[PDB]
Design a binder for this molecule. Structure first.
Ligand SMILES: *[C@@H]1O[C@H](CO[C@H]2O[C@@H](C)[C@@H](O)[C@@H](O)[C@@H]2O)[C@@H](O[C@@H]2O[C@H](CO)[C@@H](O)[C@H](O)[C@H]2NC(C)=O)[C@H](O)[C@H]1NC(C)=O
Ligand SMILES: *[C@@H]1O[C@H](CO[C@H]2O[C@@H](C)[C@@H](O)[C@@H](O)[C@@H]2O)[C@@H](O[C@@H]2O[C@H](CO)[C@@H](O)[C@H](O)[C@H]2NC(C)=O)[C@H](O)[C@H]1NC(C)=O
Ligand SMILES: *[C@@H]1O[C@H](CO[C@H]2O[C@@H](C)[C@@H](O)[C@@H](O)[C@@H]2O)[C@@H](O[C@@H]2O[C@H](CO)[C@@H](O)[C@H](O)[C@H]2NC(C)=O)[C@H](O)[C@H]1NC(C)=O
Ligand SMILES: *[C@@H]1O[C@H](CO[C@H]2O[C@@H](C)[C@@H](O)[C@@H](O)[C@@H]2O)[C@@H](O[C@@H]2O[C@H](CO)[C@@H](O)[C@H](O)[C@H]2NC(C)=O)[C@H](O)[C@H]1NC(C)=O
Ligand SMILES: N=C(OCc1cc[n+](Cc2ccccc2)cc1)C(Cl)(Cl)Cl
Ligand SMILES: *[C@@H]1O[C@H](CO)[C@@H](O)[C@H](O)[C@H]1NC(C)=O
Ligand SMILES: *[C@@H]1O[C@H](CO)[C@@H](O)[C@H](O)[C@H]1NC(C)=O
Ligand SMILES: *[C@@H]1O[C@H](CO)[C@@H](O)[C@H](O)[C@H]1NC(C)=O
Ligand SMILES: *[C@@H]1O[C@H](CO)[C@@H](O)[C@H](O)[C@H]1NC(C)=O
Ligand SMILES: *[C@@H]1O[C@H](CO)[C@@H](O)[C@H](O)[C@H]1NC(C)=O
Ligand SMILES: *[C@@H]1O[C@H](CO)[C@@H](O)[C@H](O)[C@H]1NC(C)=O
Ligand SMILES: *[C@@H]1O[C@H](CO)[C@@H](O)[C@H](O)[C@H]1NC(C)=O
Ligand SMILES: [Br-]
Ligand SMILES: [Ca+2]
Ligand SMILES: [Ca+2]
Ligand SMILES: [Ca+2]
Ligand SMILES: [Ca+2]
Ligand SMILES: [Ca+2]
Ligand SMILES: [Cl-]
Ligand SMILES: [Cl-]
Ligand SMILES: [Cl-]
Ligand SMILES: [Cl-]
Ligand SMILES: [Cl-]
Ligand SMILES: [Cl-]
Ligand SMILES: [Cl-]
Ligand SMILES: [Cl-]
Ligand SMILES: [Cl-]
Ligand SMILES: [Cl-]
Ligand SMILES: [Cl-]
Ligand code: NA
Ligand code: NA
Ligand code: NA
Ligand code: NA
Lengths: 527, 176, 352
């Protein structure tokens, strides 16, 4: 019976057998007051404190959110869907600790993605027990509010100030600072890591002064705040809040009355109307996301980045070879996970309309122009791949690369990776390639489980990635020093070296997507 | 190894075996087949070419190094033999520019570019293709050791070709 | 020392650790242990460092040896705590008598029960900590003796004896490698043979005798010491490296064993300053100088002898790799000690 005394009371964990060893898991520890009733849309409130023992022996409720119903019965989509009951009462976290209890272990804190609209820490691919077992780090993950319930903004108004889900995360980091030493952890060696919106969140914690003292360094997988889906403008945020009020019959004159009316609506009515606060959504639509609130975010984050206003520390940043492909089957014409998705020029053009709704004709043409000068054989998969690269480069790769350059210009060591391995177990079709989100299971060491039907090469790759991540967290340097591995050089804005991650030849390369990113970063913002 | 290294000691043959047979790591059946190809290739061609280039460039002259990675669509030899010895020649001499000869369009494009780089090298001492946004070919220095890959798809700048293997052949093996 | 030494007139803020062999390995481990960071100022490592192959026991070995000891003492249980409790009732003699056999094949340098990665004193594999700069930032003084390996040859190697010149044949040399490299492949032993047996070139009969001494010395002491020093200095700290080349006039061991492992210690502790002890005048002078250099290192972080026109001791950088020779005659600055041999041991041999 493993009981840990926290600042708020006792918690009971459970023993897990992992790899002929033991891990102690505490699943579903509360870290805030349930944000119900008058607390909906408000910042998370501190916890009351309890006598008796809290049983942290099962995952807690996931936060309210719309579920992906595009492919019912299909494991490729459904593996991302919540695997616990949805509730507003969802502010809980998980802790995995090595057995026997470590003395001063580095802590890795996971922040899930899901476009700030979806996600939960209880997903199978986020199971921290392997990292705990293999590297003897402590792994922490938390649920945070998503969608309108987490990011509804009426700027300056504390009844709905925006960024609630980010403050949820922040309160969790705080919990780690105050409690993790009791679990055998070192609060002075905390590394945040997250993927997609989780990665954007991480990058925002690097920018928020309230988060400065709550962590040591950061790992950003397929995401950063400067991605075009990551930050909602104040103009948009108010138009969307008002549109939601209209849909729910909560339109008032007094802005506080609106929020009070929204506070009486059932979560389903809010969730059902979130989709329509925008006239034209994209498959990457972030209806309710981070805003410049003047609290968590003191200024427009591009300005803070440009002018060196962020936590000075090491970062590890990276992206996957085919970031954009997954999004094409959620709207783009001619695309399907059930055929090779050979699309014509006209279908490509229509595709741009879907992914670039408010963009001028000239703007769409310029994308077409940059991505359609073939080299040079008229392969039929020409437009199919171009559209994937368009969506991937614009939304993920180029912003990640720009973030890394800007951050490193202020003197901090940065390491950049390019993930190129397609899972042998991928349920999605071959044309989709090395997909968005499919490095995660390697980071969390799923292929170390020899039962799971991954190949031997995949076990080796995962083991190496796990070691590099752990060394980064512990020592700020993502080397694998024992097995004649390729040394990972720092990324400087000059040479721009990056490391390829694959099952065969691990290589040092330079200037990822140089041509494409000049288009997106320099030219396209003017459009 | 006996066939390719007749007068070499048992220990010498073992050391080759040792360097080329620590797999990474799946027990693919083509393991030894490919290792022997790389042994013969690295020892007889690649490592000496790389050593020559380093030594020559140390005396101040510009040098350019390429790695040819395209297998002819018309190759009569089997697939396992890959990008064979001698099969860059037809690209240098511009055979695939003849649209009758049943080479692919990509191969025509590659040959045209190689022909231009060779010609510019001969005329001007600099193997650039300057007109078609081509990858710039950097000089090879004994330090960074940059080289250019020649292929039908992505033309790239890389460093330290066969670093591990060539240290074995160039430093250790001559002592054997 | 931190809590009490001020009462003895000492300065707890000026503490220098020094040790030889396993003592030196211990010192190097204190540089790595966070619990030892605030307990000393700098470090002197004589003929030893944690990265020497005898210095750290793997977790795999440690458990196999613990269990083997339990077996020998009749303390085998299922519960691991019961084992220790059974071992706690054994008389020390029974434990000591069985320590030798927890290993199937020991060497003259067998460290049956040594440091391990415990997750307390040592938070991680120390090669990883060294490589990634995770250690106390301060000055070190490191060094080795000219004939580290010779002493170990008379404790097992065939044809060797302290009572004759120990001229061994090729076959005896090969058998010697078996003794010193038990779990190593045939190819691995061959590669050692190959590297150390291309003579230059006269067929002197003491050829194999000296080669085996150098093999054991370079592998176990010199190359690890040099690697430690390079790695430690790459993170910006001043380091000083010495090569001790003086054979004591009072050495009871035979001449062929040369400048032996452990025989710099008496010079460091200043025994030859005692004019009664039958050391030579030159040895008194050398010891006095070494004592001053050690003291200046401890007091000021710089092992100079500044008063008697002594050779200045340059810092060791991973580039030039300068080191100072310690001898009774000409004190010299040299570079890249055992360059050829150490490339073999440090780069190639670990793969074997
Ligand atoms: C901010 O406000 C309006 C949004 O109007 C919205 O009303 C919501 C309740 C919801 O139904 C949503 O779909 C709807 O768009 C935007 O103006 C819209 O643009 C259309 C263009 O056809 C106009 O017809 C309307 O003014 C309005 N929608 C409709 C059909 O009523 C406005 O553009 C927006 N600001 C933006 C997005 O920049
Ligand atoms: C690949 O599939 C798409 C998607 O739509 C189809 O999916 C098929 C697997 C099948 O189940 C079919 O019933 C379903 O409609 C195909 O695009 C569709 O093409 C048809 C005409 O051919 C159009 O009428 C549809 O609008 C269009 N759907 C979309 C989403 O635009 C596509 O043709 C197919 N490509 C192939 C066969 O290579
Ligand atoms: C870890 O375990 C065994 C050690 O077995 C040992 O039993 C001890 C009580 C002691 O007597 C010791 O000498 C003995 O070796 C190792 O296996 C040994 O290897 C020999 C090879 O001949 C085998 O016969 C046995 O399995 C065993 N020894 C004997 C004779 O019983 C095992 O290899 C070791 N792991 C290592 C050292 O890698
Ligand atoms: C140097 O001595 C060794 C060690 O063994 C011998 O030591 C001698 C001083 C003497 O007291 C003798 O009784 C003792 O055995 C000699 O090696 C030995 O050689 C003999 C045969 O010549 C072998 O039968 C022994 O196995 C072997 N001992 C060992 C430890 O292997 C060695 O020959 C001698 N060398 C000389 C004389 O130069
Ligand atoms: N893109 C979204 O919805 C479409 C969408 C929904 C769910 N997913 C999960 C997923 C992830 C990687 C590969 C395949 C599926 C992707 C895209 C947001 Cl993030 Cl909710 Cl805005
Ligand atoms: C906590 O869990 C244990 C499981 O054995 C149980 O004994 C205890 O009553 C639980 N406490 C609850 C349910 O409040
Ligand atoms: C853990 O390490 C920190 C520095 O990282 C140290 O200050 C602290 O005392 C340690 N905690 C322990 C071992 O209790
Ligand atoms: C808005 O309503 C709130 C709650 O009744 C009230 O406190 C405030 O006075 C109102 N604001 C204005 C200026 O109408
Ligand atoms: C190092 O290599 C060995 C096999 O030689 C393997 O067992 C181990 O998992 C590797 N370590 C890492 C971190 O990749
Ligand atoms: C340059 O590109 C054009 C097509 O845009 C082509 O006709 C020409 O052959 C190319 N030149 C070289 C030398 O590759
Ligand atoms: C081992 O024995 C100790 C002492 O009796 C006891 O505390 C412990 O429960 C035992 N462990 C197991 C799991 O058998
Ligand atoms: C310096 O030289 C003098 C003799 O000239 C000697 O007495 C003294 O011991 C020397 N000092 C040291 C530290 O070697
Ligand atoms: Br995702
Ligand atoms: Ca690519
Ligand atoms: Ca590698
Ligand atoms: Ca090109
Ligand atoms: Ca010498
Ligand atoms: Ca002198
Ligand atoms: Cl209310
Ligand atoms: Cl911190
Ligand atoms: Cl057109
Ligand atoms: Cl830094
Ligand atoms: Cl470059
Ligand atoms: Cl020139
Ligand atoms: Cl490089
Ligand atoms: Cl101190
Ligand atoms: Cl022989
Ligand atoms: Cl210094
Ligand atoms: Cl020199
Ligand atoms: Na709900
Ligand atoms: Na948006
Ligand atoms: Na040992
Ligand atoms: Na005793």
């Amino acid at each position: 019976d493993i009981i840990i005394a926290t600042k708020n009371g006792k918690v009971r964990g459970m023993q897990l057998t992992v790899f002929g060893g033991t891990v102690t898991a505490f699943l579903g520890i509360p870290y805030a007051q349930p944000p119900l009733g008058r607390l909906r849309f408000k910042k998370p409130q501190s916890l009351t404190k309890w006598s008796d023992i809290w049983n942290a022996t099962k995952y807690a409720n996931s936060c309210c959110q719309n579920i992906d119903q595009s492919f019912p019965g299909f494991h490729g989509s459904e593996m991302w869907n919540p695997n616990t009951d949805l509730s507003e009462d969802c502010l809980y976290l998980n802790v995995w600790i090595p057995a026997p209890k470590p003395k001063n272990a580095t802590v890795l804190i996971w922040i899930y993605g899901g476009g700030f609209q979806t996600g939960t820490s209880s997903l199978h691919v986020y199971d921290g027990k392997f990292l705990a077992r293999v590297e003897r780090v402590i792994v922490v993950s938390m649920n945070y509010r998503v969608g309108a319930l987490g990011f509804l903004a009426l700027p300056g108004n504390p009844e709905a100030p925006g960024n609630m889900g980010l403050f949820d995360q922040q309160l969790a980091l705080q919990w780690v600072q105050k409690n993790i030493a009791a679990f055998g952890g070192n609060p002075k060696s905390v590394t945040l890591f997250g993927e997609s919106a989780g990665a954007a969140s991480v990058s925002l914690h690097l920018l928020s002064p309230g988060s400065h003292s709550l962590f040591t360094r950061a790992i950003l997988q397929s995401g950063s705040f400067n991605a075009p889906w990551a930050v909602t403008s104040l103009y948009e945020a108010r138009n969307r809040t008002l549109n939601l009020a209209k849909l729910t019959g909560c339109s008032r004159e007094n802005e506080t009355e609106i929020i009070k009316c929204l506070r009486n609506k059932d979560p389903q009515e809010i969730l059902l109307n979130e989709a329509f606060v925008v006239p034209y959504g994209t498959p990457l639509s972030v209806n309710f996301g981070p805003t410049v609130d003047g609290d968590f975010l003191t200024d427009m984050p591009d300005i803070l980045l440009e002018l060196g206003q962020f936590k000075k520390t090491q970062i590890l940043v990276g992206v996957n070879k085919d970031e954009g492909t997954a999004f094409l089957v959620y709207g783009a014409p001619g695309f399907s996970k059930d055929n090779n998705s050979i699309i014509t020029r006209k279908e490509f053009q229509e595709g741009l309309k879907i992914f670039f709704p408010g963009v001028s004709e000239f703007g769409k043409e310029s994308i077409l122009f940059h991505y359609t000068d073939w080299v040079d054989d008229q392969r039929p998969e020409q437009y199919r791949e171009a559209l994937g690269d368009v969506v991937g480069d614009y939304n993920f790769i180029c912003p990640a690369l720009e973030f890394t350059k800007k951050f490193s210009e202020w003197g901090n060591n940065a390491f950049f990776y390019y993930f190129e391995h397609r899972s042998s177990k991928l349920p999605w079709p071959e044309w989709m390639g090395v997909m968005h989100g499919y490095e995660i299971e390697f980071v969390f060491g799923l292929p170390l489980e020899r039962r799971d039907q991954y190949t031997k090469a995949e076990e080796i790759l995962s083991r190496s990635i796990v070691k590099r991540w752990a060394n980064f967290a512990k020592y700020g340097n993502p080397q694998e020093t024992q097995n004649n591995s390729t040394s990972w050089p720092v990324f400087k804005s000059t040479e721009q070296k990056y490391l390829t991650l694959n099952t065969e030849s691990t290589r040092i390369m330079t200037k990822l997507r140089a041509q494409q990113c000049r288009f997106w970063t320099s030219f396209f913002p003017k459009v």
